């Protein structure tokens, strides 16, 4: 009863303190920065091995190999330089909505409608890729998963829950339960010490991995949050949603910084990533093409239009040399 | 020029041909999506077939292989994962004919049928409707008429008319009758004619897909 009014008053205090900590907008500060100019990105490679729509994709830290997962029951690992298929792992469940590629390169992970995260050991004897481990405990479809190291893995599921697992033990070590809607995205900080997670309640929560409690909560979207990605310095992140708008928040300022939106855009976001320096924002849409925004000027600096269906996954190499976009036409495009 | 890379390219081509043959094998198998409200006959039709958030049931019949996907054991925002089932051959929707008076239940069943039939992803996918528990429906109408569920019902409280009226109510929930077809069958346990009905509907939708592929349609 009175606790609801207490929560209302606390939210009141939070947002007029956030207003009290706002002086000038990002646009007002960055009006003095020269625009990046119209950048033209040409497709350099087309990885054509998948038969169904591609749902996930992840780059290696060496920025050469990339893993991609399709609904045809296969996740395959490509050498992007030569377009050769290094590996082709068949999945026990054809319903895969996420995949991650370990920073060491020794493992890959996948998951989906089966509520199980499967870790495959790439670098083993016997010359085959075998299921190193299966993680169960989530009661909803897995939306995302990232590798903290060779033994710690963070998953987000559609049961409004994120979890940190010890792979060797095989069971959850931490359970983050703050969201109310289905968690659909995930992004680790560059230091892999805290991470953000955007859910279907139009809210993005920031979690401290070590202690397991939510630090800050960010609102501002009207619809489901589909993608999230930290800024390279780790002090900001961008989110995309179904209301066809992206927005850049800030941790220390604790409030939204910029809103990337165009009246010509009416289709929701599916994937968000920054560039090497953070000056560009790459956003994948349902209108079958990617957009490149000036992250500081908030104007569409470019368009990546080469896909015949919606772009479902998008990633940028660690060295920033290229950007890979997957889509529902079963082809990956490596742009540079 | 490709010194030790020639073996890498050969490996790539070989696993590519394995991918090609696996996809060809998977393209010869008919996928069905099983849906329906809770406590319905959704489970009892799997027993009619010869036979965790996803359930897969493989069964073969007359040199045709069916993968039936049950998704009811997953509580999540349906719009976040239903698009995964785009391109499924058909949707098997189970409705309990004995729940017209219990709670109303057919109101939610019709709401779910309307939501899934007119969905943006299943705009043309055929629906096979299984009206289960028809035998239990015999004595439900001798003591409780169809008027409770349908206020505007005007007819004799007989199976041969009430059941037809219910089927007509269910089938007129699609706004695209020229592009999608709804097959209705009152589930019978005699000689497993349900599997034959599924085979006939799947054959019709396969014929339509072939006509589209060849450009005749």
């Amino acid at each position: 009863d009175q606790l609801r009014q207490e929560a209302e008053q606390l939210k009141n205090q939070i947002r007029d303190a956030r207003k009290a900590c706002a002086d000038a907008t990002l646009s007002q500060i960055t009006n003095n920065i020269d625009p990046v100019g119209r950048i033209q990105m040409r497709t350099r490679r087309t990885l054509r091995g998948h038969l169904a729509k591609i749902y996930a994709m992840h780059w290696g830290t060496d920025s050469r190999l990339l893993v991609s997962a399709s609904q045809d029951g296969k996740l395959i690992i490509w050498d992007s330089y030569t377009t050769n298929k290094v590996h082709a792992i068949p999945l026990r469940s054809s319903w895969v909505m996420t995949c991650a590629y370990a920073p060491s390169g020794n493992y890959v992970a996948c998951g989906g409608l089966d509520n199980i995260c499967s870790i495959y050991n790439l670098k083993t004897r016997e010359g085959n890729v075998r299921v190193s481990r299966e993680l169960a405990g989530h009661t909803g479809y897995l939306s995302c998963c990232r590798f903290l190291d060779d033994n710690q893995i963070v998953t987000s599921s559609g049961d409004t829950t994120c979890a940190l697992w010890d792979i060797e033990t095989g069971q959850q070590t931490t359970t983050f339960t703050g969201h109310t809607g289905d968690v659909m995205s995930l992004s680790l900080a560059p230091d892999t010490r805290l991470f953000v997670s955007g859910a279907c309640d139009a809210s993005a929560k920031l979690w401290d991995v070590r202690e397991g409690m939510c630090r800050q909560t960010f609102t501002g979207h009207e619809s489901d949050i589909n993608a999230i990605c930290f800024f390279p310095n780790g002090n900001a992140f961008a989110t995309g949603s179904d209301d066809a708008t992206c927005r850049l928040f800030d941790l220390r300022a604790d409030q939204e910084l910029m809103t990337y939106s165009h009246d010509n855009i009416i289709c929701g976001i599916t994937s968000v990533s920054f560039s090497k320096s953070g000056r560009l924002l790459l956003a994948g849409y349902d209108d079958f093409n990617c957009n490149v925004w000036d992250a500081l000027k908030a104007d569409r600096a470019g368009v990546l239009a080469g896909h015949d269906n919606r772009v479902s996954c998008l990633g940028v190499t660690d060295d920033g040399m290229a950007v890979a976009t997957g889509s529902w036409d079963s082809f990956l495009k490596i742009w540079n | 020029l490709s010194a030790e890379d020639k073996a890498a390219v050969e490996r790539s081509k070989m696993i590519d041909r394995n991918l090609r043959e696996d996809g060809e094998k998977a393209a010869r198998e008919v996928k069905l999506l099983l849906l329906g409200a809770g406590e319905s006959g959704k489970s009892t039709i799997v027993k009619q077939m010869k036979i965790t958030g996803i359930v897969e049931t493989h069964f073969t019949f007359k040199d045709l292989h069916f993968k039936m996907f049950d998704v009811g054991g997953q509580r999540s925002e349906r719009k976040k994962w239903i698009h995964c089932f785009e391109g499924v051959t058909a949707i098997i929707f189970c409705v309990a004919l004995s729940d017209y008076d219990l709670v109303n239940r057919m109101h939610e069943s019709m709401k779910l049928f309307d939501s899934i039939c007119n969905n943006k992803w299943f705009t043309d996918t055929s629906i096979i409707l299984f009206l289960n528990k028809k035998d239990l429906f015999e004595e439900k109408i001798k003591k409780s008429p169809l008027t409770i569920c349908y206020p505007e019902y005007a007819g004799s409280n007989t199976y041969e008319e009430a059941a037809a009226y219910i089927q007509c109510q269910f089938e007129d929930l699609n706004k695209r009758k020229d592009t999608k077809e709804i097959y209705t069958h009152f589930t019978c346990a005699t000689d497993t004619k349900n599997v034959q009905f599924v085979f006939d509907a799947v054959t019709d939708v396969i014929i339509k897909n072939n006509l589209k592929d060849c450009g005749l349609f």
Partner: single-chain antibody
Amino acid sequence: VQLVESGGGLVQPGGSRKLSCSASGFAFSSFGMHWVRQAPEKGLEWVAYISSGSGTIYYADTVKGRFTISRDDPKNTLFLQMTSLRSEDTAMYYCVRSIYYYGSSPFDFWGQGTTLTVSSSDIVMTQATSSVPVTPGESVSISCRSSKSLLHSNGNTYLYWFLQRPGQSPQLLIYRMSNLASGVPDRFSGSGSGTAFTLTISRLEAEDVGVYYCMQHLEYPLTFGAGTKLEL
């Protein structure tokens, strides 16, 4: 992982004989297979190779025509048939595993060996030294030279370093001139540039004395080095 091969023994010169290599413990169908022989008083020499799926076969110029190589993938077996077996073909034959993708470690596992006995353009790899005195706890550096620059246009320097202990099959140490094979202690290190390479062993612990071989992999045929012996 085991590759046990048989089919040796005394053979009348000019006859025929086949060697069978049975493999158990790995996905045999995914590995390319090599036959490499070592004469009773000489170094290693590459004989034959079949790719995965038998789609590509190469033979050394010495045994080309007389020798043929095949595999039975369902039975996980390797076959080398030899016809007109002259007296220069008496040697110990080794069955070698090698898988080629990006970042793989080919030539990583070797069989135990048959002991066939017959009664009576190529890149040249030169290990200048042949025998080196060594004291435990010290550091040594085996050298290798190449007639052609092993460095390729794509940045890979295809040089492999193998170690053969007395009475044992050779063991992979270094692949592509810098990478350590799995299970090899980090004391070994590889370095060098085109046509000049070095294998450095630091704080040399014992029980690794043997013959160090320096093999190229830029072009077929694969030519080994002469061999460098470490003795206490």
